[model samples]
Target: VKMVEIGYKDVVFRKAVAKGRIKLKPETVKLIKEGKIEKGNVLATAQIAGILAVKRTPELIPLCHPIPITGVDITFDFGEDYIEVTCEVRAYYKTGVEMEALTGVTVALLAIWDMVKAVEKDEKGQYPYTRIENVHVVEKVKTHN
Candidate 1:
């Protein structure tokens, strides 16, 4: 088992966009929208978390290459009972940043769940409706330098 050798590959501009969503109860969503979550500023915290996750993707995913991440953008969209997260990563390297984007989106969703878990719990102390899904790379692009 060895990491793929990319030394022969040329450096180029690369970008990747990933997206995912977390399902929550309507009440939990409302609390998040109102900034009433006890953890404080759910979206703000999640955004930072996502960006950090993007930079550290290689550490978490063993096979992912550690490359210079030029930029990271994370956005959130609120639905009635769901929150969608989008993570975009840009770099000038031989390998694509798809894993970084995916990691960012996943960690951002997890941050949301962590901040709102208290309200999402049911009478039996279980999270019956909280779920994360649809995690995928929306786009990947590479351009000659």
Candidate 2:
């Protein structure tokens, strides 16, 4: 298969804005745009954290083949309210790094919610801790002799 599993990770608070989409309260937008999300740069932290997490996927998830990743591209766009994380993983091996890529995104998402829970609505919201959706293997190749 060329395109592998595509996963998505998101935060949800019963009484607050979640889903990391366009619809959000102005206060939330102000907080994110003003760089007042709480601790620090959520986008920066998420990108770095995801990059690191992708490297350690073999250890966390079983049935996963450890392959030398050729490239890991992370892109995102924020609307002063929410952030959209898109990851594109590339590898040349018998197995795909879809799981690893997904795991990375989920973990990164969690880190953001974890560090900035104080400013978010519903303090007891399930911080996703990890969620993987829309994980697509952008590139993959394997040759048989």
Candidate 3:
């Protein structure tokens, strides 16, 4: 694996924002909205999961630098059939945090699925329509500091 060589350069301010969604059946959404899920609060748990995922991004992704994360924020918006998850990460380091933000979104969306797996299951004990979709990096910025 080839890792970027950033050791010689000075640290900078870096930021990244990513977005994704968990599309679930109406039944599952209703269960979550009604606070009927036995596991816990869907949005709250997912948000924490996202933040933690961002901090652990380097361990998860090979060749990623172990940047010190300065901040992390995760937000969720509800729709009729899905929940939109956005993760923003900031770091003062030699490399950007785009991977961290993306990892956050990925974990957050999966956390939603994990929380609702019982209700999302079909007759065959499978997820028929539940999906994690539209995962992408929306913004990445680097500033000299």
Candidate 4:
């Protein structure tokens, strides 16, 4: 019902990494690789979207602390029929930043989906092959300072 009180907790160096994958048709993937998605650069746009999402995670999710994010790194790896997104967040705060990393990965996947939906649709105008999966924190570290 309320945000956790961390006033007494010592601030520490915190880092979190999150990862997710979006499945797409091979043709759609090819279009993305060729930078022909018609919505602009797919990977670049998604990377920027993820970084922005990390900084604004508190506003997007209620009860999350508004920590000062010191850094964000977003990378995309492509398979024949899927794209994997990894988002890493860094901060010096009382709470962990896994939520921010998760939000970043989620938004980045969503942005990729948005950019390619036009080509992902089937003849019935449905997305039978497009999906987002495996969204979770890949790593988290905290060091006393």
Candidate 5:
């Protein structure tokens, strides 16, 4: 257990927001929006996956404190050439939940790709037009009260 020691007794409430985007062809976007993907509804599945990923962040990443998750949310937006994923996480702990939020966004983005890889892949099994971009933490704040 290489986790950090977070003195929870002295901690405060914290929250974080993360965002990511995945570029897809218009056809792929239509397929997702129309719920034609063989795997199922991309957005719905991705949202749940994001929340699960957020809760399991500590297990996946070393040095991440195991903090109590107060809340988690995932949202999606469809753009002309991409789909945007946003994740929000709240926790009360010695450490902030930025990593958790970021992880959720990442997993959600990956889930989108996974569900659409068949359509996105080229004849040579290459993703020439598909790309995941702008995965980052957008905000982090702590309440001292």
Candidate 6:
């Protein structure tokens, strides 16, 4: 028998240097290099996307509700091998924001991947991709759960 429990995700993007993926957009690369990400801040865009995604989670997914979100955060860590994205969304509503947070990261990652796939594309016209590794929110105050 399978048991079902529910909770939201505290997603995390690990860390990666942008050098490889940044090749797709030279201008953006330069901007990133020069600390001009604010001019074209994908990180910021990802953050907003996460929040909106959380608020609209039900519209995209069949089993979700059109709920309200109290808080949302999307974070990215840049390292030598890869970039990590973390999504945290809080909603004092009926359901969890796991889908919403994951969705936001999914969209943002896909957007960035689309841009980088020109170079990242593999043979046979396929682009090898990274997948979500892990996500969870270990603790909560249990307002009324």
- Per-residue error for 71 in candidate 5, Å, reads 0.7
Report the error of model 5 at residue 59, Å.
1.0
Model number with the top lDDT:
4
Say what the RMSD of model 3 is.
1.2
What's the lDDT for residue 79 in model 1? Answer: 94
| Candidate 3 lDDT tens digits, 18-128 | 999889987778888899999889989999999999888888999998888989999988888888999999988888899999999999999999999988888999887
- Model 4 lDDT vs. the true structure? 0.95
Please, what are the lDDT tens digits per residue for candidate 4 over residues 1-145? 9998998999999999999999999999999989988988999999999999998899999999989899999998999999999999999989999999999999999999999988899999999999999999999999976
Order of all candidates by lDDT, from best down to worst? 4, 1, 5, 3, 2, 6
Please identify model 6 stretches exceeding 4 Å from their true place. 1-40, 122-125, 129-141
Global lDDT of each model? 0.94, 0.56, 0.91, 0.95, 0.91, 0.51
Candidate 3: Cα lDDT at 96: 88
Using Cα atoms with residue i matched to residue i, what is each candidate's TM-score against the true structure? Answer: 0.97, 0.63, 0.94, 0.97, 0.93, 0.58
RMSD of 4: 0.9
In the range 93-145, model 5's lDDT, one tens digit per residue, is 78899999999999999999999999999999999989989988899998877
Each prediction's RMSD to truth? 0.9, 11.0, 1.2, 0.9, 1.6, 8.3
Residue 44 lDDT in model 4?
93
Total clashes for model 6 = 12
